[PDB]
Each structure stands twice: as C-alpha cells, then as structure tokens.
Amino acid sequence: GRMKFTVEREHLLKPLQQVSGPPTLPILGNLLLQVADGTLSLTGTDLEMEMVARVALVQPHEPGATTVPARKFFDICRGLPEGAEIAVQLEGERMLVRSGRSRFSLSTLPAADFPNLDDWQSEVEFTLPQATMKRLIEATQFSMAHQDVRYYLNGMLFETEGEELRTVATDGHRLAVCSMPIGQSLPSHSVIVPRKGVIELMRMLDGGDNPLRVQIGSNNIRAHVGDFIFTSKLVDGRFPDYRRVLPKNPDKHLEAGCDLLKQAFARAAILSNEKFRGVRLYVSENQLKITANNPEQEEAEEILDVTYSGAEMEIGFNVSYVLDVLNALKCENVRMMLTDSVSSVQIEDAASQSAAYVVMPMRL
Amino acid sequence: GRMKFTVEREHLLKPLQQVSGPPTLPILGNLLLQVADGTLSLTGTDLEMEMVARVALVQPHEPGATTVPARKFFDICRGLPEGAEIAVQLEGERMLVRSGRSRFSLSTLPAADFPNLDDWQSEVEFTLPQATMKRLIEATQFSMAHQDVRYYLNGMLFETEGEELRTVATDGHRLAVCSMPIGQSLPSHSVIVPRKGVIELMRMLDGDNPLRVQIGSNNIRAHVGDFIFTSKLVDGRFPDYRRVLPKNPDKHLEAGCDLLKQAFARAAILSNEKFRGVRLYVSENQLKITANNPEQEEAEEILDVTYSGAEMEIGFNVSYVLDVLNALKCENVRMMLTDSVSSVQIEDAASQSAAYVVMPMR
Amino acid sequence: VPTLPXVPXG
Amino acid sequence: VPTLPXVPXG
Numbered sequence A: 001g002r003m004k005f006t007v008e009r010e011h012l013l014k015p016l017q018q019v020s021g022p023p024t025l026p027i028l029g030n031l032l033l034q035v036a037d038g039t040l041s042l043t044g045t046d047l048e049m050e051m052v053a054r055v056a057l058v059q060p061h062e063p064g065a066t067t068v069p070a071r072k073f074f075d076i077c078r079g080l081p082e083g084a085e086i087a088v089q090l091e092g093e094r095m096l097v098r099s100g101r102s103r104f105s106l107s108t109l110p111a112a113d114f115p116n117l118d119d120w121q122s123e124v125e126f127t128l129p130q131a132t133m134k135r136l137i138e139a140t141q142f143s144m145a146h147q148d149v150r151y152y153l154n155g156m157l158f159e160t161e162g163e164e165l166r167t168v169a170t171d172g173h174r175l176a177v178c179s180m181p182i183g184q185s186l187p188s189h190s191v192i193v194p195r196k197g198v199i200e201l202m203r204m205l206d207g208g209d210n211p212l213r214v215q216i217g218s219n220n221i222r223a224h225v226g227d228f229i230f231t232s233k234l235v236d237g238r239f240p241d242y243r244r245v246l247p248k249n250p251d252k253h254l255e256a257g258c259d260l261l262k263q264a265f266a267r268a269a270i271l272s273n274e275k276f277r278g279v280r281l282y283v284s285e286n287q288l289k290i291t292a293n294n295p296e297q298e299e300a301e302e303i304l305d306v307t308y309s310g311a312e313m314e315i316g317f318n319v320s321y322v323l324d325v326l327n328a329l330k331c332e333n334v335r336m337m338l339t340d341s342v343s344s345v346q347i348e349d350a351a352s353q354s355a356a357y358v359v360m361p362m363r364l
Numbered sequence B: 001g002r003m004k005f006t007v008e009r010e011h012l013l014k015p016l017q018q019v020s021g022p023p024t025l026p027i028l029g030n031l032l033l034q035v036a037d038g039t040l041s042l043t044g045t046d047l048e049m050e051m052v053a054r055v056a057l058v059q060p061h062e063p064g065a066t067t068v069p070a071r072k073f074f075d076i077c078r079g080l081p082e083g084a085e086i087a088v089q090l091e092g093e094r095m096l097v098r099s100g101r102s103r104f105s106l107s108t109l110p111a112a113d114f115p116n117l118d119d120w121q122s123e124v125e126f127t128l129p130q131a132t133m134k135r136l137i138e139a140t141q142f143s144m145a146h147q148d149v150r151y152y153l154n155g156m157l158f159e160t161e162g163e164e165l166r167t168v169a170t171d172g173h174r175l176a177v178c179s180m181p182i183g184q185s186l187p188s189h190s191v192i193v194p195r196k197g198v199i200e201l202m203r204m205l206d207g208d209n210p211l212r213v214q215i216g217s218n219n220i221r222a223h224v225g226d227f228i229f230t231s232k233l234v235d236g237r238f239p240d241y242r243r244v245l246p247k248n249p250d251k252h253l254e255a256g257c258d259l260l261k262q263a264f265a266r267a268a269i270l271s272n273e274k275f276r277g278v279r280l281y282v283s284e285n286q287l288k289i290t291a292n293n294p295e296q297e298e299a300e301e302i303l304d305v306t307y308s309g310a311e312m313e314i315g316f317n318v319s320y321v322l323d324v325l326n327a328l329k330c331e332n333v334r335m336m337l338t339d340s341v342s343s344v345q346i347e348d349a350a351s352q353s354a355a356y357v358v359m360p361m362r
Numbered sequence C, D: 001v002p003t004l005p006x007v008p009x010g
Helices: A009-019 A070-079 A130-138 A195-204 A258-271 A319-329 B009-019 B070-079 B130-138 B195-203 B257-268 B318-328
Strands: A004-008 A030-035 A039-045 A049-056 A064-069 A085-090 A094-099 A102-107 A124-128 A156-170 A174-193 A212-216 A220-225 A228-233 A252-257 A278-284 A287-293 A299-305 A313-318 A333-338 A345-349 A352-359 B004-008 B030-035 B039-045 B049-056 B064-069 B085-090 B094-099 B102-107 B122-129 B156-170 B174-193 B210-216 B219-224 B227-232 B251-256 B277-283 B286-292 B298-304 B312-317 B332-337 B344-348 B351-358
Touching (some): A004 A009, A009 A039, A009 A085, A030 A070, A049 A195, A064 A070, A064 A102, A124 A156, A124 A174, A130 A156, A130 A174, A174 A195, A174 A319, A195 A220, A195 A228, A252 A258, A258 A278, A258 A287, A258 A299, A258 A319, A258 B070, A258 B102, A278 A319, A319 A345, A319 A352, B004 B009, B009 B049, B009 B070, B030 B070, B064 B070, B064 B102, B122 B130, B122 B174, B130 B156, B174 B318, B257 B277, B257 B286, B257 B298, B257 B318, B257 B332, B277 B318, B318 B344, B318 B351
Antiparallel strands (some): A004 A085, A030 A039, A039 A049, A049 A228, A085 A094, A094 A102, A124 A212, A156 A174, A174 A352, A220 A228, A252 A333, A278 A287, A278 A313, A299 B102, A333 A345, B004 B085, B030 B039, B094 B102, B122 B210, B156 B174, B174 B351, B210 B219, B219 B227, B251 B332, B277 B312, B286 B298, B344 B351
C-alpha cells in the first residue's frame, strides 16, 4: 500500500513495548500498524486480549495499514541509537525501515486479516488512581490458582459495590480479598478477569499522574491509560462468595510484630517437610511457639512474645501460605483471628481492614 | 563427641557461604565441622574439589568433629537476626543449634566418613593480585566448551612461562587467550582446570590483596585469606593456541567497539536463528554488515572504519563475534583478517594482553 | 489438607 | 561451519 511515516525513536519505544505482550498463529505474532489523520496506531492481540497504542505524527506521512513481526520490529527500534529517526514505508510484501545507514526489510501480512474485536456495551464505568489498581492486584494476585480445573479460579474477581472496588483470588486452600474506595457511586457487578488480563493490567501502570479509566461490560473489560487501551475477555463462570469462607466469630485474636513473626516462620520452614511444608503453632497466654519436623527427624522451635489471652490451642499450617500472606501485608503488626484447630484463620494488618486473608489449617 | 562452640553470626556467615556452594551422596551435602586449637574449620567437598574455611574461636569451646547438612546450616545462620550469637553442641546423632529462643536439631553423619583428598607435591608456586587472576579468567571463560566429548575442552588451560601466567579456552570454533605478568621467574607448566574449578576460583576473589597458587601434576590449590581451595585437574592434552593463531593476517581493520557491537546486534535480529550467520563486506575505510533469515528478511549496516587493504567478504557467527566484543569492553577494536575461509584475530586496539580467534562460516 | 469450604468444592 | 585448525578435531 501507500503507508509511510517517519517518527523519532523516543516517541515510538514505549508504544511498541506495551503492545508487545511478551508459538501462535502467524498473524498473531504481528503488530497492526495504521497511519491515519496524523496518527499512528499500533495494535497487538491474541484473540482474547488486545492492546492499542496511539502515536502522534508531526512529520509527513501517507495513510495505510499493514502488519509486521512484533518482537523483531520492537528489537529493531530498541537497538537503534538514542535520538534516532525511523522512516518506514511499504514495498510490496515487505516493510522497509531506515534509520541512518541501517536498513531493515521485514515481511508483512495483510491488515485485512488482522482480527478486530467486536463492540460491546459498557455497563460500569469509573476512573481511579493507578496506585489504587496496583494495590488491589498486588494484595491478592499471589492467591490465584494456576491451571486449575475450575477455570474461574485461574483469574481474579473484580467486584464493584457502593463506593469501593474489590478484588478476590483463591486456589481452594487460601483466599485473599482487598477493598479500596474510589469516591464514586457505582453499580454492583461481579466479573472474573483471566490470569493474563491481570498481568497485562499490571503492565500498563507507569506510576504516573495519568488516571486509569475502566469500562466493564458483561463479557469484556477495558482500561485506558494515556494513549493506551487494553481490552480483555472475561472468564465465563461463577466465582465463589468470599463472604462464606470468612470465619464467623473468630474470637481468638493474636497480635504480633509483622517482621519478627515472618523471620520466625522463615527459620522454622527450613526443617519442614519439603512437600507438605507443615509447621505447628502453640498459642498460649502472650506467647506463640512454632515447631517444624521433616522425615529426617530434624526439628526447629521458635518462641515469640505476642499479645493473646484466649484459650490455649494447637494448630498446623502450610508455612508457605502463611509467609505469602505476611509478605503481601508489608505490615508492622499482624492480627490473626482463630477459632479452633480445624477451622480457617483470618489474617489482617493490625491497623487496616482494607485487606484480609483466609488460610485453611492442616492436620498434624 | 564433645564438639562445642559459640560464635557470632557475623563471623560465621561469609565462611559458611563460601564452603557450601555445591543432589549427590548424602555426605557430600554436608559440611565437615572441626573444633581444634581455638579454631573452627568448615570444609565442603564434591569429591573432585574442596573448600576449607577457618574461623577464630574467642569464646569457650570443646574440640570435636562432625558433619551437618550444609544448605540447612547456612540458611539457619543467615536466617537469624543481625548480631545474634550461635551456640552449637552435639547430642548423639544430632547437632543442636541455639540462638536466643530459636532451637534447631540437625542430623549428622560421622566425620570419619568425610572424604580426604590425597596429598600431592607442589611443582609450581606463585602469588599474584586477585584482580589479575580475575582478569585472566573473565577474559577467556566464555570461550570454554560445555559438555564436549573432548573432556579437556570443558576446562580452562592455565599455563606458566617466564614471567607470565596465561589462560586459554576454546570450543573448537572460537578461542580466547590472555596473558598477564606476575613479576616472578616461573617454570614452564601447563594444566587444565575443570569447569567447576574455574567457577569456584572466581567466587573466592574480591582486588588488590594477594592470592597464592600451588600447581601440582594433578591438583591445583589457591589460598585467599582464611580460605583454601583445592581442585583436581583434567587429565588430557590441551591443543596449542600458537597453532591456531592466523599466520600473517595482513588485513587490519579498526572500528569503534560500541558502534560495531550495536551494528552487529541489530543485524543479528534478522539472521538465521540456528546458524546466526552475518556477512561482512570490507572496503576502503568502510564495513558493511548484512543478515538474512529463511523468511527472506534482510538487514544492512554501514560503518566508517579504518581499513586500507584489499576488498573482501567473509561470513561469521554473529553470536561468537558479540561474545568477543562483550568480553573486550573496549574503546576501539582491531580485527586482523587473511581471507574469507581463514580464522580472524580480534583484540583491543590498545591492549595486546588478550586475543581472540574466530573461525568464519560459508 | 482440608480446604476452604467453597460450595461446592471445599 | 568449518573449525579452528586443530589436530585432530578441526
């Protein structure tokens, strides 16, 4: 075709990287390039999610479209020297890229075969800081399942209610939930965002002062950041209700230092079973004792001063799940809410209820 | 036994890390601990090499010896808080570690079963700065073969001659050689250090203070501070790097290290993923690099260089070339060519201490 | 290794 | 992919 444009490397680099979401169909390894109305559009897709970037063209150009290998094109522009000028044109089934005395000829596929994602009605719409979205995902991402028969557990639930956005993730043995205000009256809506959507979501946040705008629409979610738009399919299924796995009346409240508890569990875990990773907790008046044994009959014991005045109790835990929660809390004091040795425990930051974590015990 | 000692975590941390740098035999996963004469000794081995560290015991202690799982003991000590004191004593088939209100009971194996390396006669002996040894290895390590049937190519040659120590590595396609002066009259000797020995050698380096080396007919030893490393040599015949250096490479090309590297890196994007072949056209004060892949895509680079010889075109594995440029970390590089089917020699334009030879492709 | 009581699933 | 002139081996 007639497509032709010339742009600075510095204006093309971040656009290219973001649409290059790091063994597919031939066309799906390519970016769609579109020149039109002083704008260059770059699109990458995998039939389930889609990333579009827009770049303003201040130099002469000619409208047109084509597709080119995404990674090769990004590596070419990234390999050029800082401040380089990149001129692009079409020549039959080839795209010629020129910068200085560097010449590149990339094979293309017609743009008419690049798949467009059909339209969908937005049902919920809101904007929130990038830092808020970052906190919601980092608080729960680790609890997601991976390649679970229940395809709905591989993703992360995104729930709206009143003034708050909520994320939930669970693999069947432990659960994480986190709610954040965003200062807008929103409808109620529950959707599941697949694992890869969560990742791509995280990738879009540049920790800048450009708010994030979300559109949720039954079977699709969309996110806007600056000149970037990410669209992903949702997972069709019913997510379990976190309210029904929260322990009722966990009246045995233990409070301990975040860091000291973590170091004690990390040390005990050295002599725990490599497969099951079980540690044993003995809770008594203002004292917590952690023990661990492995098939080799090695033993570890930790004693910590804590705040606790309830009944004595013995309870076992996968220490990896406990450490996962403590690292996600990044807290100064942690609160554990216990019921009995065979019931789930709720763990929270002692001074914040925004996030909550539920972990099932083991039998030892 | 009676073994017992109490030592600050900080005095035990780095020693433990150096010796426990390795799923083989149970005893080979264990450190040999020895208390004797106000000194704690930690030894780790893999049957082919061993590392020994010595720590001073300023607190009461009782002599004795045992073996304990290395990784677990290290992780326990490193997991204890800063400034912690670690008390160790034996309780039958177990070692008890105590620090604060933390208690650990590790299984042991008898020290009498920890394998001893045979004694050997030192034939060459010298000392040199750690930075010098660092330079010698970093200059050639990347050229070693990996899992080559020619067992002797999997290691690194260490050759003494006159005043210089030399290192040589090659995989049959490229070769690296680096010679440094150490200011001592040395006997001519040539021995092959195995791959894992080279790695451990680098681990125990930091870069001005001295490093003492002892080479024998079948073993090599290195002393650094309170550490002693010993490895078995590779029993074979290493090729002669003199016989692969091109004779009379009269075509001399000089170019910018960085500019040449970036050009090769861009061209490599469209080279064959398996063979990685790029083509170099050399002409008067100009170099042109081209690449092609099966999908018929094409790259081209043109650089200004210093060259006045006959025109020539020659192919290369662009990965081997980039490896050399990454190793030189140079301002200007010098390529010495002969013809399109002969090896090339690459060096830092302002340093002859290291040289690289790379065979072309068709 | 009992589970979170999802309904079903546990 | 010819080799360094090594005897034997090339």
